[PDB]
Structure 1
Amino acid sequence: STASALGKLQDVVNQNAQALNTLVKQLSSNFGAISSVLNDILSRLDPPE
Structure 2
Amino acid sequence: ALGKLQDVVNHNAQALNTLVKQLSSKFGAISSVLNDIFSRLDPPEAEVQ
Measured against aligned partners, the alpha-carbon deviations of 1:1-49 in whole angstroms (never above 9, x if no partner) come to xxxx111001110001000110000000110111110001100011017
Give TM-score scaled by structure 2 length. 0.84
Q: Is residue 27 from structure 1 mapped to residue 16 from structure 2 by the alignment?
A: no
Q: State the secondary structure of the residue aligned to 2:30.
A: coil
Match of 2:42 among 21, 41, 46: 46
CA–CA distance in 1 between the matches of 2:26 and 2:2? 40
Structure 2 regions of 5+ residues with no counterpart? none
Q: State the secondary structure of the residue aligned to 1:43.
A: helix
CA–CA distance in 2 between the matches of 1:31 and 1:16? 24
Q: Which has more radius of gyration?
A: 1
Identity fraction in percent: 91
